[PDB]
Design a protein around this motif. Sequence first.
Motif, PDB file in Angstrom:
ATOM      1  N   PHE A   1       6.657  21.337  39.478  1.00  0.00           N
ATOM      2  CA  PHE A   1       6.912  19.980  39.946  1.00  0.00           C
ATOM      3  C   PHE A   1       5.637  19.150  39.873  1.00  0.00           C
ATOM      4  CE2 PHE A   1       8.866  16.938  43.198  1.00  0.00           C
ATOM      5  CZ  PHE A   1       9.973  16.625  42.409  1.00  0.00           C
TER       6      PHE A   1
ATOM      7  N   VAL B   1       4.991  16.089  34.800  1.00  0.00           N
ATOM      8  CA  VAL B   1       6.275  15.995  34.105  1.00  0.00           C
ATOM      9  C   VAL B   1       7.487  16.115  35.042  1.00  0.00           C
ATOM     10  CG1 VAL B   1       7.738  17.006  32.314  1.00  0.00           C
ATOM     11  CG2 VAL B   1       5.268  16.906  31.989  1.00  0.00           C
ATOM     12  N   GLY B   2       7.540  17.204  35.802  1.00  0.00           N
ATOM     13  CA  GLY B   2       8.646  17.436  36.714  1.00  0.00           C
ATOM     14  C   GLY B   2       8.998  16.286  37.634  1.00  0.00           C
TER      15      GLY B   2
ATOM     16  N   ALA C   1       8.181  25.634  42.889  1.00  0.00           N
ATOM     17  CA  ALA C   1       6.809  25.364  42.449  1.00  0.00           C
ATOM     18  C   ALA C   1       5.808  26.114  43.327  1.00  0.00           C
ATOM     19  CB  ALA C   1       6.537  23.871  42.499  1.00  0.00           C
ATOM     20  N   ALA C   2       4.624  26.390  42.790  1.00  0.00           N
ATOM     21  CA  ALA C   2       3.614  27.132  43.546  1.00  0.00           C
ATOM     22  C   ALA C   2       2.797  26.279  44.509  1.00  0.00           C
ATOM     23  CB  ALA C   2       2.684  27.855  42.598  1.00  0.00           C
TER      24      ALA C   2
ATOM     25  N   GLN D   1       5.215  31.162  44.342  1.00  0.00           N
ATOM     26  CA  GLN D   1       4.487  31.474  43.121  1.00  0.00           C
ATOM     27  C   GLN D   1       5.317  32.472  42.305  1.00  0.00           C
ATOM     28  OE1 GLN D   1       0.149  32.501  43.248  1.00  0.00           O
ATOM     29  NE2 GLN D   1       0.814  34.482  42.428  1.00  0.00           N
ATOM     30  N   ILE D   2       5.610  32.125  41.058  1.00  0.00           N
ATOM     31  CA  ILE D   2       6.401  32.994  40.191  1.00  0.00           C
ATOM     32  C   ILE D   2       5.484  33.955  39.452  1.00  0.00           C
ATOM     33  CG2 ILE D   2       7.972  33.083  38.220  1.00  0.00           C
ATOM     34  CD1 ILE D   2       9.106  31.973  40.892  1.00  0.00           C
TER      35      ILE D   2
ATOM     36  N   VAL E   1       9.185  23.196  33.394  1.00  0.00           N
ATOM     37  CA  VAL E   1       8.100  22.227  33.318  1.00  0.00           C
ATOM     38  C   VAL E   1       6.918  22.753  34.145  1.00  0.00           C
ATOM     39  CG1 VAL E   1       9.616  20.251  32.934  1.00  0.00           C
ATOM     40  CG2 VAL E   1       9.072  20.950  35.256  1.00  0.00           C
ATOM     41  N   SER E   2       6.693  24.064  34.041  1.00  0.00           N
ATOM     42  CA  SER E   2       5.622  24.756  34.759  1.00  0.00           C
ATOM     43  C   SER E   2       4.459  25.097  33.848  1.00  0.00           C
ATOM     44  CB  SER E   2       6.136  26.068  35.361  1.00  0.00           C
ATOM     45  OG  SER E   2       6.543  26.968  34.337  1.00  0.00           O
TER      46      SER E   2
ATOM     47  N   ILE F   1       3.503  30.439  33.308  1.00  0.00           N
ATOM     48  CA  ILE F   1       4.655  31.340  33.383  1.00  0.00           C
ATOM     49  C   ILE F   1       5.210  31.591  31.983  1.00  0.00           C
ATOM     50  CG2 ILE F   1       6.908  31.806  34.370  1.00  0.00           C
ATOM     51  CD1 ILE F   1       6.333  29.859  36.574  1.00  0.00           C
TER      52      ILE F   1
ATOM     53  N   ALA G   1       8.670  21.860  27.619  1.00  0.00           N
ATOM     54  CA  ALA G   1       7.893  20.872  26.892  1.00  0.00           C
ATOM     55  C   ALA G   1       6.714  21.569  26.207  1.00  0.00           C
ATOM     56  CB  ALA G   1       7.411  19.788  27.852  1.00  0.00           C
TER      57      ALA G   1
ATOM     58  N   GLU H   1       4.406  28.659  27.010  1.00  0.00           N
ATOM     59  CA  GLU H   1       3.312  29.176  27.826  1.00  0.00           C
ATOM     60  C   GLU H   1       3.449  30.675  28.109  1.00  0.00           C
ATOM     61  OE1 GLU H   1       0.739  27.199  29.844  1.00  0.00           O
ATOM     62  OE2 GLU H   1       1.035  25.896  28.094  1.00  0.00           O
TER      63      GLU H   1
ATOM     64  N   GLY I   1       8.885  17.791  24.100  1.00  0.00           N
ATOM     65  CA  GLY I   1       8.380  16.727  24.955  1.00  0.00           C
ATOM     66  C   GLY I   1       8.132  15.545  24.041  1.00  0.00           C
TER      67      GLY I   1
ATOM     68  N   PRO J   1       4.254  17.983  21.413  1.00  0.00           N
ATOM     69  CA  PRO J   1       5.347  18.197  20.459  1.00  0.00           C
ATOM     70  C   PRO J   1       6.707  17.723  20.960  1.00  0.00           C
ATOM     71  CG  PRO J   1       5.009  20.170  21.652  1.00  0.00           C
ATOM     72  CD  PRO J   1       3.857  19.253  22.039  1.00  0.00           C
TER      73      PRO J   1
ATOM     74  N   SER K   1      -1.688  15.346  32.688  1.00  0.00           N
ATOM     75  CA  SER K   1      -2.497  16.469  33.141  1.00  0.00           C
ATOM     76  C   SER K   1      -3.930  16.502  32.626  1.00  0.00           C
ATOM     77  CB  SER K   1      -1.837  17.792  32.780  1.00  0.00           C
ATOM     78  OG  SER K   1      -2.678  18.859  33.173  1.00  0.00           O
TER      79      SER K   1
ATOM     80  N   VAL L   1       7.438  11.132  27.749  1.00  0.00           N
ATOM     81  CA  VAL L   1       7.635  12.574  27.724  1.00  0.00           C
ATOM     82  C   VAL L   1       8.976  12.984  28.309  1.00  0.00           C
ATOM     83  CG1 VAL L   1       6.609  14.794  28.224  1.00  0.00           C
ATOM     84  CG2 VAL L   1       5.172  12.744  28.114  1.00  0.00           C
TER      85      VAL L   1
HETATM   86  N1  LIG Z   1       5.476  17.538  24.740  1.00  0.00           N
HETATM   87  C1  LIG Z   1       4.783  16.756  25.542  1.00  0.00           C
HETATM   88  O1  LIG Z   1       4.624  15.430  25.229  1.00  0.00           O
HETATM   89  C2  LIG Z   1       4.174  17.236  26.813  1.00  0.00           C
HETATM   90  C3  LIG Z   1       3.468  16.272  27.602  1.00  0.00           C
HETATM   91  C4  LIG Z   1       2.883  16.682  28.819  1.00  0.00           C
HETATM   92  C5  LIG Z   1       2.999  17.993  29.241  1.00  0.00           C
HETATM   93  N2  LIG Z   1       3.714  18.933  28.430  1.00  0.00           N
HETATM   94  C6  LIG Z   1       3.831  20.322  28.933  1.00  0.00           C
HETATM   95  O2  LIG Z   1       4.387  20.177  30.227  1.00  0.00           O
HETATM   96  C7  LIG Z   1       3.850  21.117  31.118  1.00  0.00           C
HETATM   97  C8  LIG Z   1       4.406  20.856  32.502  1.00  0.00           C
HETATM   98  O3  LIG Z   1       3.277  20.742  33.332  1.00  0.00           O
HETATM   99  P1  LIG Z   1       2.609  19.391  33.820  1.00  0.00           P
HETATM  100  O4  LIG Z   1       1.965  18.649  32.709  1.00  0.00           O
HETATM  101  O5  LIG Z   1       3.446  18.633  34.816  1.00  0.00           O
HETATM  102  O6  LIG Z   1       1.439  20.140  34.624  1.00  0.00           O
HETATM  103  P2  LIG Z   1       1.082  20.252  36.161  1.00  0.00           P
HETATM  104  O7  LIG Z   1      -0.087  21.197  36.218  1.00  0.00           O
HETATM  105  O8  LIG Z   1       0.895  18.874  36.694  1.00  0.00           O
HETATM  106  O9  LIG Z   1       2.374  20.895  36.900  1.00  0.00           O
HETATM  107  C9  LIG Z   1       2.764  22.240  36.634  1.00  0.00           C
HETATM  108  C10 LIG Z   1       3.542  22.767  37.854  1.00  0.00           C
HETATM  109  O10 LIG Z   1       3.865  24.108  37.559  1.00  0.00           O
HETATM  110  C11 LIG Z   1       3.732  24.890  38.729  1.00  0.00           C
HETATM  111  N3  LIG Z   1       3.492  26.272  38.298  1.00  0.00           N
HETATM  112  C12 LIG Z   1       2.228  26.792  37.969  1.00  0.00           C
HETATM  113  N4  LIG Z   1       2.102  28.075  38.363  1.00  0.00           N
HETATM  114  C13 LIG Z   1       3.269  28.404  38.963  1.00  0.00           C
HETATM  115  C14 LIG Z   1       3.705  29.592  39.549  1.00  0.00           C
HETATM  116  N5  LIG Z   1       2.972  30.705  39.603  1.00  0.00           N
HETATM  117  N6  LIG Z   1       4.982  29.596  40.092  1.00  0.00           N
HETATM  118  C15 LIG Z   1       5.801  28.484  40.067  1.00  0.00           C
HETATM  119  N7  LIG Z   1       5.397  27.304  39.488  1.00  0.00           N
HETATM  120  C16 LIG Z   1       4.140  27.302  38.952  1.00  0.00           C
HETATM  121  C17 LIG Z   1       2.590  24.226  39.499  1.00  0.00           C
HETATM  122  O11 LIG Z   1       2.553  24.528  40.876  1.00  0.00           O
HETATM  123  C18 LIG Z   1       2.750  22.770  39.165  1.00  0.00           C
HETATM  124  O12 LIG Z   1       3.466  22.060  40.179  1.00  0.00           O
HETATM  125  C19 LIG Z   1       2.868  21.976  30.348  1.00  0.00           C
HETATM  126  O13 LIG Z   1       3.445  23.213  29.961  1.00  0.00           O
HETATM  127  C20 LIG Z   1       2.530  21.079  29.170  1.00  0.00           C
HETATM  128  O14 LIG Z   1       2.045  21.773  28.057  1.00  0.00           O
HETATM  129  C21 LIG Z   1       4.296  18.578  27.234  1.00  0.00           C
END
Ligand SMILES: NC(=O)c1ccc[n+]([C@@H]2O[C@H](COP(=O)([O-])OP(=O)(O)OC[C@H]3O[C@@H](n4cnc5c(N)ncnc54)[C@H](O)[C@@H]3O)[C@@H](O)[C@H]2O)c1
Lengths: 459, 459
Positions: free
Chosen positions: B16, B19-20, B42-43, B62-63, B85-86, B89, B108, B111, B142, B145, B212, B381
Amino acid sequence: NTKKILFKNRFVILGFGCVGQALMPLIFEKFDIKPSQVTIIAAEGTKVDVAQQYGVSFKLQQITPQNYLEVIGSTLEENDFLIDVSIGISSLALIILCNQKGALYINAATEPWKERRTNYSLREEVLRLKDKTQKTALITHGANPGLVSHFIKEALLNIAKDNGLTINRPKNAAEWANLAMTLGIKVIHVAEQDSQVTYPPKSPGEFVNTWSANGLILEGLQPAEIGWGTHEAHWPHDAYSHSNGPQCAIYLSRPSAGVMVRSWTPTLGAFHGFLITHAETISLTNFLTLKNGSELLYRPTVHYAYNPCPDARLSIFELKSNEWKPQNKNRLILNEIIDGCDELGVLLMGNQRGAYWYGSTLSIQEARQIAPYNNATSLQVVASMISGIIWAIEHPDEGIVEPEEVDHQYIIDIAKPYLGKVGGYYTDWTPLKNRGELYPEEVDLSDPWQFFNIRVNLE
Amino acid sequence: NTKKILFKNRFVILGFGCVGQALMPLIFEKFDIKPSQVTIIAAEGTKVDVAQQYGVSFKLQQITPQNYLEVIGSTLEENDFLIDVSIGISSLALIILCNQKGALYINAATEPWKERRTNYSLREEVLRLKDKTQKTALITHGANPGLVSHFIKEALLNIAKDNGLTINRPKNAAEWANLAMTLGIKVIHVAEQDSQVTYPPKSPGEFVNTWSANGLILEGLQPAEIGWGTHEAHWPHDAYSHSNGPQCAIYLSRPSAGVMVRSWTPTLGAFHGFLITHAETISLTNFLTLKNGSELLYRPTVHYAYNPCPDARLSIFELKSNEWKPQNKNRLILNEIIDGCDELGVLLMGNQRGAYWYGSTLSIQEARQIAPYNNATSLQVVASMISGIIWAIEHPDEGIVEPEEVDHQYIIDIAKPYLGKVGGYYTDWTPLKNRGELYPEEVDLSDPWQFFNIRVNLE
Ligand SMILES: NC(=O)c1ccc[n+]([C@@H]2O[C@H](COP(=O)([O-])OP(=O)(O)OC[C@H]3O[C@@H](n4cnc5c(N)ncnc54)[C@H](O)[C@@H]3O)[C@@H](O)[C@H]2O)c1
Ligand SMILES: NC(=O)c1ccc[n+]([C@@H]2O[C@H](COP(=O)([O-])OP(=O)(O)OC[C@H]3O[C@@H](n4cnc5c(N)ncnc54)[C@H](O)[C@@H]3O)[C@@H](O)[C@H]2O)c1
């Protein structure tokens, strides 16, 4: 006004830009003079009402080689003072003219007639007139060049007391150079970090800076200039020297704005500044040079490590992005800045006590309560000038003089009230620590003060 | 809500962050779903009240590899949809699990489990499962890509109509590659320029970005990745290839954030972007590759030309300044941005009509009237994701699929209302014109589209 200096003559200031406007307040603050005793000549008008607020006459005129003798000449009487804060006008020509008129003169930088001539020739051309004029003409006396020279001497003495050493304040250059060597100074940086931020944000298509945008652009366009220290054991791949040019200087192919160097500042600490070129690089280096006759024994490395205000950072980025084509628009941030400060000072490295930084850390807030039409940057420049101006008045017959020939304590004691918090700071920092490991850059563990370690080599 | 899609299942979104949170609005905007049909895992918690405003359950957990099967598994029923959207993981692990549960899945970006493993392996590891799962799993969908792949196909067709050519919309990759070659495409750039500015200004010690901060940092730390086109006639001095790695890719020693490339954008025009690495570089290159069997005939050069928001520019500058040591603080600018826009798109070069740029130019103003908890960047995105999510629902049994295998028109028609002004732009620009002369950089006048001319070589 218990310290209001009496002045029965007049101040002729040519040019009314960034520096000139910011000077106004300090002149009426330190002099019990009438506005009628001040006159301003400039080529371009201004959207600012500084002249009108003080009630100082302003003449709109372009000074050329064909009219300067009459226009400027008819405005100077014996003992008057020509404050030169213009651009594109021959300092040499103005200097000679002032002497003929028996008037004082000062400038924040040596300039030629508007037309790419080396910064070296310009200085030697005017310096080769030492024993020709009688009236005092203080040159390149701004924050830097200028105040910076006085900071080096101050630091040199402080490091001496902190080393237990007890000597007399050196007079000639040789003694200053000797003190530098006896203290182990291998390299001196003019380390400055402008953190003034603004509102509204920067807009595309404009070069924004706390001072003259063109000054910064021009400096960043020229090749990196460096005073080569005798300790240096590495030779830059893209370096070269001028057989007839300055013997102490070394140059780099890449533009100064394209070269980064590792330096240090008290407020933020370790940082990467632009190795922007300057005038007082060769003059300071030679001033701290030592030799038995025709064989150099000692000489520290001297160069600039500049980090402009974030807006000027974005500007330079956009400049390079435009293939070195300067933006069609320039802007001076003054009222729009809301927070931040300007840390101007000198870093002396080599002494066992550790790296030492002595300088001025002035915030925009303190600068505004101290004087109007001023930001942190401008205030540090005019503080130095008003000090230099006062110096020349009580020493009107010294001929052409450079800041190195002026007593640092005299200048510093007058400017200090304009520089915010000023002092020295020791640090265990070196360009060898806090290093990264993602991309190992070849370093010389033998001597951290080697240019080989300071210059940020991409590869 | 005449276009409100009915959904009788539930949406499980893990993560969350940037993106989320920005996705929430689009889900309730396109789906006639109840908040009870949504669950978030979310963690780390959040200082934002997005979940509370929509009334969606939020589980702080935490997953890990040891509990994901039970925690995530017990939350998915047949036909449910896991929006991934984590970070940290295993997408592969989640993908397989979803299949077992008969649930849909999207992400998106691919990972691995939290622990430096090449971006290549991660993709092949999950791609080598094409004919193993039944349920649809849309990956790396996303803005980029993702959306970027759909923009390339759209541009490919537009350039064809503008060339008088009249053919059928290609299906397989070979046909798309063939159309690219027949059109003379020598190089494709993902050209983006973020102009979102903010208030208050940036502060020292923090990495500020419209998305991010860690994502940008990590990408900029890795070595430059480039799809080598068959037209390239020059070999970068600091380049190298992987004998076993991707055959189409070439790498550069220097970090991607340390490599600049000359590209173009409609709003501002010619600029210097960072050659930041990405995932969809290898996938797109191969997708547009052509050969008779084991001998490549055609392949364009493909790489990213990114120019982040001025704050992220200052951030990267400070990052390098800190010897690649990331700032101890990160910040996502959302509400603090006051003006600007994000121009995300693709530049196709080589065709006689001239360089062509097709993409989205979304301003912060339009993005705010369109959806809350969103800036220009985030909105582009999530627009792509919500489109991809809708696609998967009506195509639940397609197995693991990449954006290249999805009909661009379907996606673009759904996202378009979220991308502001979207379209194509022709230009006579090339990396060979508007060049400077202060420092002549060796160029190849023969073919402006040569990487030799695009890469900004310091020397
Ligand atoms: N295609 C695109 O245009 C595009 C753009 C931005 C981001 N992305 C992708 O989107 C992503 C989503 O992340 P974001 O940018 O919001 O980053 P972020 O770091 O802001 O959020 C990621 C969330 O994942 C959770 N997550 C991490 N470890 C965890 C765990 N152990 N258990 C449960 N949840 C966990 C976190 O607590 C966090 O709330 C990335 O994978 C990134 O590569 C793609
Ligand atoms: N030592 C230091 O710390 C320091 C700092 C800043 C500037 N400087 C020096 O100060 C300078 C003063 O300029 P500034 O920064 O205010 O620049 P500026 O460009 O803002 O102002 C220069 C002024 O000079 C005038 N001038 C130019 N051509 C003229 C002409 N033909 N006739 C009459 N006047 C003319 C212009 O009209 C303008 O008003 C430069 O020489 C610069 O190198 C030194």
